[PDB]
Amino acid sequence: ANSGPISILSYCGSSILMTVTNKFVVNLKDFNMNFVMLFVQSLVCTITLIILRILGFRSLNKTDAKNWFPISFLLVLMIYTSSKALQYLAVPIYTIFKNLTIILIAYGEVLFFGGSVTSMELSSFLLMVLSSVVATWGDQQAVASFNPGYFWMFTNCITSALFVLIMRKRIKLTNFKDFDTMFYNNVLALPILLLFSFCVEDWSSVNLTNNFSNDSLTAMIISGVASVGISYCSGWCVRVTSSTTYSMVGALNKLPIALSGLIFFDAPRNFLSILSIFIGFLSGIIYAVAKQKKQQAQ
Amino acid sequence: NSGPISILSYCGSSILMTVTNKFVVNLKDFNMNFVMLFVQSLVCTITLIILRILGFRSLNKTDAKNWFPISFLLVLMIYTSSKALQYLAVPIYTIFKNLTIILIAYGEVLFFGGSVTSMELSSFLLMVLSSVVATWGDQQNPGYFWMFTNCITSALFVLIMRKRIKLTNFKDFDTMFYNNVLALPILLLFSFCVEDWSSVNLTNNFSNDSLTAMIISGVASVGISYCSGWCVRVTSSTTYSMVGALNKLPIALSGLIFFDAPRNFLSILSIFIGFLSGIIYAVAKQKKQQAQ
Ligand SMILES: CCCCCCCC/C=C\CCCCCCCC(=O)OC[C@H](O)CO
Ligand SMILES: CCCCCCCC/C=C\CCCCCCCC(=O)OC[C@H](O)CO
Ligand SMILES: Nc1nc2c(ncn2[C@@H]2O[C@H](COP(=O)(O)O)[C@@H](O)[C@H]2O)c(=O)[nH]1
C-alpha cells in the first residue's frame, strides 16, 4: 500500500503545495519570529495527529523519546544553521553547497548501512553540482563579509546530513511507521523550537507583541495545515527510499517550480539559468537509472 | 614504447613548448599564424628525413589519399580554434574544449566500441566542473558558431586519425611524417585565403630575427609532434584529449608558485578540481582493465 516511488510523488506534491501556500495564500511569509511560526506549524501537526488517533495510528514513549531527542534537536539546529547561512550567502550559492551535501550524505550512508556509491550515482551528484553552479553562473546575488556565511553553511551541511542519516537509522531500528516519525518530530520539536526562539529572537511586549496580530496568526495555521503535507512525506520518503534519495528529490523539487516560473510568467530569463534546469533534469534521469542498475544487480 | 610512457612524453614535449613559446621566443603573437605553422611543420619534416637516412618510416600514394582528410581536419581544427578565440574568452573556450572530451569519449564508442564507464563519465564532469569554476573565477556571439565548429573538427580529427592509424598499422614516425608533410599544402592554402600578403607591409614584418624565432619554434614542436600520434595510438583518442587538457593545470599551478601575480580562491579551486579529475580518470582506467 505505501512503499516505493509513491512516496516521491507525495514529497513533491506536498513541497509544491507548501511552496505555493507560502507565496500566494499567505502574503509575505517572511515573518519577524521564524521559530515561533515553526512552533505553530509543529503544533498544528501535533494537534492534527491526536484528532486522527481518536478516529481510526502513532505511539508515545520514554525510551524512544531519549533516542529521538537528538533527531529533533538536529532538525531545529538544521533550520537554525540554514537561516543564518542565508543571511550572508545568496540562494544560488546556498544551493551549491546544499547540493554538495548530497555527496557527503551518500557517502555518509556508506558509513551507516553499507550501500556503496555506484559510479553512476556519483555522476548524478556531479550533475546536480554542475546544475547549480551553472545556475549561479547565471545570476548576480570587509574580509569578514563572506566569512560568517561560509561558517554557517559548513555547519548546516553536517547537521543536514546527521539529521537525515541518524533519523533513518533510528527509524529502521525501531520499525517506526510514518505517523510515528511524523509525531515524534513535531512533538519533540516543540521544546527545541521554543528554546531557539527565546535564544535568538527578541521578545518585547511593547513592540513584538503588536507585530503578530489576528491576521498573521491566521497565516500560521494556514501554513501549519500546509506543512502537514511535507511533514508526513519527508519521513515516509527517507524510510522507504534512502537518505540520499530524499536529498536528491528535495534538490530536484525546486526545478519544476523554477521551470513553472519560466512558463507561467513573463519575467526575464537566461540561457545559463534555463540550462541549469535541464542539467538538473539530466541529473535526476541519470540517478533513476543508477537505481535500476543497482536493484537488478543484487 | 607503449603505455603510460607516451603520456609522460606528451607532457614533457608540451611543457617544453610552453616554456619555449613563453621564454625563448619574445612575443610569438605573430602577424601570420599559418605561416609559422608551415615552418613548424617544415622543420618537423626535414628532421624526419635526416633521421630516416640515419637509423624509420614510409612514403606512399594510397596512404596519402586516406591520410589527407586527417591533415585537413587538423588545419581546419586550428582555423576554427583561431576564429573561436577571436570572439570568445580563453576560460570559456576551455569549457567547450573540455566538453569535446565527452563527445570524443562517446565518439570512440561509435568508432571502436569501448563503452564509457560510469566512472569515466565522472572524470569528464569533474573536468567540466573545474573549468566552469575557473571561468566563474575571472572577468574576460559570433564566436559560438566557431566553437560549435572547433568541437566537431577536434573530435573528427582525433577519432579518424586514431582510426586510420590502427587501420594501416602506422607507427609513431609514420604518423608524425604523414601529418607534417600533408599539412604543408593545406597550411599555405589557408594562409593565402585568410592572411594578408603585402610586400610593402608584411614582408618587413617577418625579418631575419622573426624567421629565427619560427625555427626555434619548429625545433620545439618536434617533441609534441611525435607524442600526439604516439599517445593517441598506444592509449586512446580520449586519453589524449584528457591528458591534453590536464596538462594545462601544472602550467597554471606553476605560474602561481613561480610568480607574484594575483590569485583567487576560485582559481586555486579549479586547479585542484582538475587534479581530482585526473585521479578519478586514472582509477577508471584501472577498474576498466580489472572488470574487462
Ligand atoms: C564555491 C564552491 C564551488 C563548488 C564547485 C564544486 C566542487 C566539486 C568538488 C569535488 C567533487 C565532490 C567529491 C567527489 C568525490 C570523488 C569521487 C569518489 O570518491 O570516487 C570514489 C568512489 O568511491 C567511486 O564510486
Ligand atoms: C550549452 C552546452 C550543453 C551541454 C551540457 C551537458 C553537460 C552534461 C554532459 C553529458 C551528458 C551525458 C549523457 C549520456 C549518459 C549515458 C550514461 C552512460 O554512458 O552510462 C554508462 C553505461 O550504463 C555503462 O554500461
Ligand atoms: N522530515 C521533516 N522535514 C521537515 C519537516 N517540516 C519541514 N521539513 C523540511 O522542510 C523543507 C521543505 O519545506 P518547504 O519550505 O519547501 O515547505 C525540507 O528541508 C524538509 O526537510 C518535518 O517535520 N519533518
Residue numbers in the entry:
A (entry chain E): 18 to 73, 77 to 161, 177 to 333
B (entry chain A): 19 to 73, 77 to 161, 182 to 333
Provide the authors' original text about this structure.
NSTs belong to the SLC35 family of solute carriers and are highly conserved from simple eukaryotes like fungi and parasites to complex multicellular organisms such as plants and mammals. In the cell NSTs function to shuttle nucleotide sugars into the lumen of the ER or Golgi, in exchange for the cognate nucleoside monophosphate. GDP-mannose transport is fundamental for virulence and essential for cell survival, making the transporters attractive targets for inhibitor design.
To understand how GMP is recognised by Vrg4 we determined a co-crystal structure with GMP at 3.3 Å resolution. Vrg4 adopts a very similar pose as that for the GDP-mannose transporter (root mean square deviation ~0.47 Å between 276 Cα atoms), with the binding site open to the luminal side of the Golgi membrane and sealed shut on the cytoplasmic side through the packing together of TM6 & TM7 against TM8 and TM9. Clear mFo-DFc difference electron density was observed for the GMP ligand in three of the eight transporters in the unit cell. Unexpectedly the three GMP ligands adopt slightly different positions within the three binding sites, despite a r.m.s.d of only 0.45 Å between the three structures. In chain C, the phosphate group of the GMP molecule forms a salt bridge with a conserved lysine (K289) on TM9 and interacts with a conserved tyrosine on TM1 (Y28) through a hydrogen bond. Unlike the position of the GMP ligand in chains C and D, the molecule adopts a bent configuration, with the phosphate group now orientated towards the luminal entrance of the binding site. In this position the phosphate now interacts with a conserved serine on TM1 (S32), rather than K289, which adopts a different rotamer configuration compared to chains C and D. However, unlike the GDP-mannose ligand, GMP does not make a direct interaction to the conserved asparagines of the FYNN motif, which are ~4.5 Å away. Analysis of the apo, GMP and GDP-mannose bound structures of Vrg4 show the presence of well−ordered monoolein lipid molecules at a potential dimer interface. Our findings that GMP adopts several similar, yet discrete conformations in the binding site now provides evidence that the slower rate of transport observed for GMP vs. GDP-mannose is due to less effective coupling between the ligand and the transporter.
